[PDB]
């Protein structure tokens, strides 16, 4: 998932953009993936209970 970023692969973001906006793109992707992982952990806790 692109999560609202231009590309879903990290090395493209590094190779194409400058740090000032590459950081924004990376931040968006990181928050998206952190949210996905947190959702997985929460459902795992419910199922474990």
């Amino acid at each position: 998932s692109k999560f609202g970023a231009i590309s879903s692969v990290l090395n493209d973001i590094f190779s194409r953009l400058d740090p000032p906006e590459a950081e924004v793109q990376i931040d968006r992707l990181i928050t998206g993936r952190l949210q996905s992982l947190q959702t997985y952990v929460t459902q795992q806790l419910i199922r474990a209970a």
Binding site: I6, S15, R16, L17, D18
Partner: protein, 48 residues
Amino acid sequence: FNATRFASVYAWNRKRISNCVADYSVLYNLAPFFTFKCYGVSPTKLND
């Protein structure tokens, strides 16, 4: 870039560039080309 004549805005000219090595420092180092702001890609990364 060094063409003597440029077409009008409505009849804008379109040129095809392919199958060649492109060096973007030849135009960047020229002083007159001041307004060079680039979308979707950094101006520095163009060489890579």
